[PDB]
């Protein structure tokens, strides 16, 4: 019985929990009001908070299904151990230990390695299963160039780009982005900033889509300068540039329909795309359809030499 170890920064799972998951977030320091009644605004303009957490719950729930579906050597278990909710990794990793795993394969449900999401995770995984002991962790660490994942972007952009009209199939420009980090990261030589360049140009050539662009978004709001351009403000300066009468935006970064994508995008991209002449597309995220769920599997099976 091996260990599945699943992680993610996390979503409130109710309502009521979003200060707590706002004061996590902020380390410790409760929000201001006006601070939480925003963030509360936009989960309800996004139709409400109670389906967001629960994309995660499947998607590990799945991966597990099907691992234990395609191959019969191993029996895996699914542990989810997310940044700011409940159950927080150490609680996922000391309940595996608890259950008698002594081996654990861990993966984040973010493609691109990154020091403060994907390096973050697994070594506080890491470290606290070497302080229970006897629990050694594999941990993925990228896995945006895994063949059936481009594949899984590459179907949804060919799809959309067929499904335009030919005015906007020749004049329209595909924005590949992820979740911004203060640019200090580069401190620690962190290649994330490199993979989602690497991860937008393998999808615009298997899409065979020419005019694209990298962007960034959601940065979080502190005295830091964070990961530019902005997906707000590169939508702008390429509209001005040269016209474009459709903006297709593929959130690469995220693995499911979250406020990032659902606000940040949906709404935060169309009020450009809308402010301006332009046509708005978003295509499907992955969440927890079998495509992706296959994609995510064979990762893991890779991982381990099978
Ligand atoms: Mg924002």
Same mark, same amino acid.
């Given at each position: 019985?091996?260990?599945?170890?699943?992680?993610?920064?996390?979503?409130?799972?109710?309502?009521?929990?979003?200060?707590?998951?706002?004061? @996590?977030?902020?380390?410790?320091?409760?929000?201001?009001?006006?601070?939480?009644? &925003?963030?509360? &605004?936009?989960?309800? *303009?996004?139709?409400?908070?109670?389906?967001?957490?629960?994309?995660?719950?499947?998607?590990? @729930?799945?991966?597990?299904?099907?691992?234990?579906?395609?191959?019969?050597?191993?029996?895996?278990?699914?542990?989810?151990?997310?940044?700011?909710?409940?159950?927080?990794?150490?609680? *996922?990793?000391?309940?595996?230990?608890?259950?008698?795993?002594?081996?654990?394969?861990?993966?984040?449900? +973010?493609?691109?390695? =990154?020091?403060? =999401?994907?390096?973050?995770?697994?070594?506080?995984?890491?470290?606290?299963?070497?302080?229970?002991?006897?629990?050694?962790?594999?941990?993925?660490?990228?896995?945006?160039?895994?063949?059936?994942?481009?594949?899984? %972007?590459?179907?949804?952009?060919?799809?959309?780009? +067929?499904?335009?009209?030919?005015?906007?199939?020749?004049?329209?420009?595909?924005?590949? #982005?992820?979740? !911004?980090?203060?640019?200090?990261?580069?401190?620690?030589? $962190?290649?994330?900033? $490199?993979?989602? @360049?690497? !991860?937008?140009?393998?999808?615009?050539?298997?899409?065979?889509? #020419?005019?694209?662009?990298?962007?960034?978004? #959601?940065?979080?709001?502190?005295?830091?300068? %964070?990961?530019?351009?902005?997906?707000?403000?590169?939508?702008?300066?390429?509209?001005?540039?040269?016209?474009?009468?459709?903006?297709?935006?593929?959130?690469?970064?995220?693995?499911?329909?979250?406020?990032?994508?659902?606000?940040?995008?949906?709404?935060?991209?169309?009020?450009?795309? $809308?402010?301006?002449?332009?046509?708005?597309?978003?295509?499907?995220?992955?969440?927890?359809?079998?495509?992706?769920? &296959?994609?995510?599997?064979?990762?893991?099976?890779?991982?381990?030499?099978?």
């Amino acid at each position: 019985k091996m260990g599945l170890l699943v992680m993610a920064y996390g979503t409130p799972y109710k309502e009521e929990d979003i200060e707590r998951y706002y004061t @996590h977030i902020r380390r410790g320091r409760k929000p201001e009001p006006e601070m939480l009644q &925003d963030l509360k &605004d936009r989960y309800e *303009a996004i139709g409400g908070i109670s389906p967001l957490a629960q994309i995660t719950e499947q998607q590990a @729930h799945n991966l597990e299904q099907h691992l234990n579906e395609i191959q019969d050597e191993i029996t895996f278990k699914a542990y989810i151990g997310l940044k700011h909710i409940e159950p927080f990794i150490e609680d *996922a990793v000391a309940e595996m230990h608890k259950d008698g795993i002594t081996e654990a394969v861990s993966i984040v449900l +973010a493609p691109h390695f =990154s020091t403060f =999401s994907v390096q973050s995770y697994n070594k506080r995984a890491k470290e606290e299963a070497e302080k229970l002991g006897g629990l050694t962790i594999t941990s993925v660490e990228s896995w945006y160039d895994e063949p059936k994942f481009v594949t899984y %972007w590459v179907d949804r952009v060919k799809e959309t780009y +067929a499904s335009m009209p030919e005015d906007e199939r020749e004049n329209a420009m595909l924005i590949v #982005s992820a979740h !911004s980090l203060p640019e200090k990261i580069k401190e620690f030589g $962190d290649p994330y900033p $490199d993979q989602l @360049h690497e !991860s937008a140009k393998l999808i615009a050539e298997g899409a065979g889509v #020419s005019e694209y662009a990298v962007g960034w978004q #959601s940065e979080g709001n502190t005295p830091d300068p %964070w990961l530019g351009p902005d997906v707000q403000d590169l939508t702008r300066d390429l509209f001005e540039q040269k016209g474009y009468q459709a903006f297709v935006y593929v959130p690469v970064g995220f693995v499911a329909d979250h406020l990032e994508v659902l606000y940040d995008n949906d709404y935060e991209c169309k009020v450009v795309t $809308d402010d301006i002449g332009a046509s708005y597309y978003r295509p499907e995220m992955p969440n927890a359809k079998p495509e992706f769920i &296959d994609a995510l599997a064979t990762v893991v099976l890779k991982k381990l030499g099978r």
